[PDB]
Design a protein around this nucleic acid. Structure first.
Lengths: 206, 64, 141, 262, 143
RNA sequence: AAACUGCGAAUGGCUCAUUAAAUCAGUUAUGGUUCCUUUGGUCGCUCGACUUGGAUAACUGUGGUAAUUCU
RNA sequence: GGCGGCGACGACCCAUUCGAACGUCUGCCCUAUCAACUUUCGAUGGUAGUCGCCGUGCCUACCAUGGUGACCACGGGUGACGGGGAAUCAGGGUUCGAUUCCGGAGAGGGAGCCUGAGAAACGGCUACCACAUCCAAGGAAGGCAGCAGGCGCGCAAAUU
RNA sequence: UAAAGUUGCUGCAGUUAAAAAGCUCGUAGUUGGAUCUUGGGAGCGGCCGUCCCCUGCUCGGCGCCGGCCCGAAGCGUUUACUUUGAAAAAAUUAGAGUGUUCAAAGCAGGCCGCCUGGAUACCGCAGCUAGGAAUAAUGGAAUAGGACCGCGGUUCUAUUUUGUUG
RNA sequence: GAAGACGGUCGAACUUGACUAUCUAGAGGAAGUAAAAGUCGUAACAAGGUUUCCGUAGGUGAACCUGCGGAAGGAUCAUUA
């Protein structure tokens, strides 16, 4: 069918080949998954050797990481922002590997606030009025509060993350191949990675 | 694909000149003396000797 | 050889390769033109159908009339004057007879007294012309 | 072919089996097993060709399906089972026990042993890896995967294993001076002390082996086994003792035996 | 210098977002007695195909040839001259194969003429199965 | 017996049309892969019913088509 | 009421065997009345994906302008499947190898795919092209370059 | 196919039998001057023959009052060449044995249960390995960024090191 | 969870035109070769009756002839202070 054949192609020299054999099976191509943002539709394939392969066609949740301080949480993907392959696979909201995506921050913000006890994002004047995590900013013993303060010495976050966390939308990079594994996992961008990709978003956008 | 041998070789060589008087009348001198029936029975012996005599030439080239 | 260099393998091979074409026996066998224009198409023998019985005047010196047979070959539709061997064997060839026809002996060259006749008739109506001449087989009619 | 071959042509068969070229088109294709196609001696060939109990292959069916042939400790009802190097074939009703060790001429000899000897075999280790939870695993030449071996056992060693349990007893380190049965190439069946392993990084490591008569030869490492500590072997050897006396020596030793015996 | 391409350029092994208050470089020994150059260990560049700072493994064959062309991005053409024995004529003919070979920017001081040593690795591209391992400059060439 | 199930039917056999760095051969690599089968491991490692549920075929019966290993 | 022997089948994964697949190095007949070819309908390379069992312009997007050739590329031809081998033969050679072993390819020509570990299978299926069978004329069925055998083709080849 | 030394590498021809370009330059191709180690130390046979020696710096065994003799790694102008080694399906070919009654074949067989065979050679080229260094190529110091030496300066770095821990 | 449809993809085929590899028909033309004795001559071989031949022109029933330069394979190895 859609073939993956070396023999249809011109030789190094520029001279073109003749086919000595007809298309083999093991030279499968399959159509592109072209997975989108939406409610989970993951088709299974049967592939070479009676193995399974998970065609993501719609995928929203993703087990993204926050490497800076080791945590990784299942988070809703909201947008595709940038792709180093095509400018169309941003217009057409297609998740592929090394996509730049806006994801939710609230699992990461809930973690940061349930580990360092510091309100993160959250504008001044705007208190937490319902009284949920006002309970989880106080109420320790002596030496447990001491442990949190010794740990709190190392709770400075970057200016870029602190701005992204305010909108409730972090930028993350897909490290999985959703067409193959059927997962939209990856890592949150930090440092010169995030500086580079924010400049490229800014370059194309404006 | 079959379970047959196929391996078979000639046991004589026909001589190059077919009408050397000297050969024709030396090979009939052999046939009379020793009561053989055709020149194939002579070219058979001559060929065995020639193969022996070829193998000997091959070993005399080699170092002692 | 006129280049005894130790590193001259290709000049010596590529020269010999080029100069083999100036041989007749090679040029003949290694082109289609000799194998195409061959009336037999590179075959040893060929069945054809007698369309007339032809007297051919022998060469300059000796002077008989050589009794040959004009043949339409089946495989090609090609025209052949093929000689008939021994004394009084043209009496065995009715017209429109399927004859098996061989070469004369010189690999498609004209033989003896017979101008531009390269072929002899071997069998007539699938009965051997030696067997008819010796009278062993009788002609089935 | 568009999938795995199930036949083996008689003329394509490995030379050491010594099948003729007039009985059939096909040789027995060895059943998939511990040993390679080119290195195994199938059971049928050990029954009808060597020991000559059976005549046909249907006879070998009528012997093996009665559950008599016990190849290294376990009964085998497969006529084309790949019995290979060091494996112990126990025919119980005759009270006979055979170890498949190479004659100094390429072919496997029929080498009878004591039942006391038959209880153990000797296995060349192919590699070591560390399994799922720090558990050291240990793969041999007949693929006997052993978990928790002695930690001083390295890649090219041998291990004297008990057949009735399948546990190691003692192991021979691959060191210079140790005996060596060569199990591949032109030097197949040769026995001698290991002299110099010469390391070739990226390529194959050649290994020199000095003979008992002093006729030193060499082999690629992969074709080399170790059968003893220094000069003393851990098996019983087949007669000739893996020397390979030359065609001239074989000729005059046939002449000497042919006249002296009568 | 780097991050010319549309995507971000980094070694996939080393993680560069440990929390603070220079990027540490991944490298390996190639084996077969070949010294990794100081440039590969010191360098700022990222090349996935470099046999010191990339995802490529050198095994099997080690060849050598004179550099012919340094034209396209991060790869060169070497020219391997050899003498083929035609037996009829008991002579040799000068043949050459010119293979495309990937040239890691750890090797910077390379000129067209330098005898380069190469090692067989996985197919990098359609025509390239060899990375460069060391460079010996042409006999004399110093000035 | 039939029928469901399992396994095989990708081997063997035939032919040589196509194919000129292709095929093939020697030589390596797979630290770039896949692998029914055999062989040996593994198969209370997870802290959370003395055996369950709906069929369908063979069988019996009613057929239709001029016709099929149709149904 | 509770504890167990000898097997059979099953089973995720590792390994092993059986391979397969794609890569390395070097090696092929004639032809120059084929000297420049390949390339923005991928040519050589970079970067990031898609696809694939995985390595790869395999394929997409953006790049760079490469790549090969008088050491014969590129194009054409081959009564060219390659090889182990065969004939001839002082020593060199020349010619042959469809042909029982190895490897490849194809099942009238192309193409597409189901099942399965393994097929782009044809004593499987799906079209088209060519040919051809049965028909109550609505429809159905076909693939001997398997073993025999038949026609045809031929100089040329056996028993249903 | 040999005969055909009538395709000629071995090995043909080119004044007149067929054949040297009208002449010269000229790039790839091919070929390319001479030159760079020798004398003796140790030993045997009857002046001549056959052998061992004429590179150097981290880890232990025939020993010794930090190192001397030696064992095992690792760096050592680069290639062709030659010799050896590994490795290289059988079948074919050469070839060992063996009275298929002989032979072509076969892989068997022999002995009043035992013994024995199913060997070996060749497998251009390319690849791998280890001796030899003649022949051929290639190299090194010539505005000295030249060796072999010890020294004095400068950027980054194993810790043996302060009773256990700042 | 069947039919079915939109779109993509592989892609047989079909229509249209051009390019083109081989084979075949061809009024007529223009060659060559082969015959035992056709016609016009006699160009060449003897200084072949104008020495022959080469290149290049022109011409002419035909072989050929003539110009210009060249050759000896010439009919002179030589021709005399």
């Amino acid at each position: 069918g859609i073939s993956r054949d070396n023999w249809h192609k011109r030789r190094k020299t520029g001279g073109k080949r003749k086919p000595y054999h007809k298309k083999r099976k093991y030279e499968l191509g399959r159509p592109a998954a072209n997975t989108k943002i939406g409610p989970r539709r993951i088709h299974t394939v049967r592939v070479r050797g009676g193995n399974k392969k998970y065609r993501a066609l719609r995928l929203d949740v993703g087990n993204f990481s926050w490497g800076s301080e080791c945590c990784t949480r299942k988070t809703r993907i909201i947008d595709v922002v940038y792709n180093a392959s095509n400018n169309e696979l941003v217009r057409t909201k297609t998740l592929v590997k090394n996509c730049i995506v806006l994801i939710d921050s609230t699992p990461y913000r809930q973690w940061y606030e349930s580990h360092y006890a510091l309100p993160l994002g959250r504008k001044k004047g705007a208190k937490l009025t319902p009284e949920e995590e006002e309970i989880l900013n106080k109420k320790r013993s002596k030496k447990i509060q001491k442990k949190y303060d010794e740990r709190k010495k190392n709770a400075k976050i970057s200016s870029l993350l602190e701005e992204q966390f305010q909108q409730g939308k972090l930028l993350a990079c897909i490290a999985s191949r959703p067409g193959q594994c059927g997962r939209a996992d990856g890592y949150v961008l930090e440092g010169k990675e995030l500086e580079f990709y924010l400049r490229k978003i800014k370059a194309r956008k404006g | 694909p079959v379970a047959r041998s196929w391996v078979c070789r000639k046991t004589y060589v026909t001589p190059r000149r077919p009408f050397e008087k000297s050969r024709l009348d030396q090979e009939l001198k052999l046939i009379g003396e020793y009561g053989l029936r055709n020149k194939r029975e002579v070219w058979r012996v001559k060929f065995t000797l020639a193969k022996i005599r070829k193998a000997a030439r091959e070993l005399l080239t080699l170092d002692e | 050889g006129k280049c005894r260099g130790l590193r001259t393998a290709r000049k010596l091979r590529s020269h010999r390769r080029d100069q083999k074409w100036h041989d007749k026996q090679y040029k003949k066998a290694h082109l289609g033109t000799a194998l195409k224009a061959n009336p037999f198409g590179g075959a040893s023998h060929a069945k054809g159908i007698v369309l007339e019985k032809v007297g051919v005047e022998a060469k300059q010196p000796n002077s008989a009339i050589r009794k040959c047979v004009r043949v339409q070959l089946i495989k090609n539709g090609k025209k052949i004057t093929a000689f008939v061997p021994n004394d009084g064997c043209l009496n065995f060839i009715e017209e429109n007879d399927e004859v098996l026809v061989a070469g004369f002996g010189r690999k498609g060259h004209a033989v003896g007294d017979i101008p531009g006749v390269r072929f002899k008739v071997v069998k007539v109506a699938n009965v051997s012309l030696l067997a008819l001449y010796k009278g062993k087989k009788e002609r089935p009619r | 072919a568009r999938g795995p071959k199930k036949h083996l042509k008689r003329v394509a068969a490995p030379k050491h089996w010594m099948l003729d070229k007039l009985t059939s088109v096909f040789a027995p294709r060895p059943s998939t097993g511990p040993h390679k196609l080119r290195e195994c001696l199938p059971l049928i060939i050990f029954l009808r060709n060597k020991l000559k109990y059976a005549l046909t292959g249907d006879e070998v069916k009528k012997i093996c399906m009665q559950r008599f042939i016990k190849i290294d400790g376990k009964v085998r009802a497969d006529i084309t089972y790949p019995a290979g190097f060091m494996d112990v074939i126990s025919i119980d009703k005759t009270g006979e026990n055979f170890r498949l060790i190479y004659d100094t001429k390429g072919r496997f000899a029929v080498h009878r042993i004591t039942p006391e000897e038959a209880k153990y075999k000797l296995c060349k280790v192919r590699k070591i890896f560390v399994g799922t939870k720090g558990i050291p695993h240990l793969v041999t030449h007949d693929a006997r995967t052993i978990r928790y071996p002695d930690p001083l056992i390295k890649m090219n060693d041998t291990i004297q294993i008990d057949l009735e349990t399948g546990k190691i007893t003692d192991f021979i380190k691959f060191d210079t001076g140790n005996l060596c049965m060569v199990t591949g190439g032109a030097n197949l069946g040769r026995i001698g002390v290991i002299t110099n392993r010469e390391r070739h990084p990226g390529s194959f490591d050649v290994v020199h082996v000095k003979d008992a008569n002093g006729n030193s030869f060499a082999t690629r490492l992969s074709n080399i086994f170790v059968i003893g500590k220094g000069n003393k072997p851990w098996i019983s050897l087949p007669r000739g003792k893996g020397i390979r006396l030359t065609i001239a020596e074989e000729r005059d030793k046939r002449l000497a035996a042919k006249q002296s015996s009568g | 210098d780097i991050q010319t391409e549309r995507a971000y350029q980094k070694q996939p092994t080393i993680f560069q977002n440990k929390k603070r208050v220079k990027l540490p470089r991944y490298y390996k020994n190639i084996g077969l007695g070949f010294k990794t150059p100081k440039e590969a260990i010191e360098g700022t560049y990222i090349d996935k195909k470099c046999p010191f700072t990339g995802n490529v493994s050198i095994r099997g064959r080690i060849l050598s040839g004179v550099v012919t062309k340094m034209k396209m991005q991060r790869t060169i053409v070497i020219r391997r001259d050899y003498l083929h024995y035609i037996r009829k004529y008991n002579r040799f003919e000068k043949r050459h194969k010119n293979m495309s070979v990937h040239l890691s920017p750890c090797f910077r001081d390379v000129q067209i003429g330098d005898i380069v040593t190469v090692g067989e690795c996985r197919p990098l591209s359609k025509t390239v199965r060899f990375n460069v391992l060391k460079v010996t400059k042409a006999a004399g060439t110093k000035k």
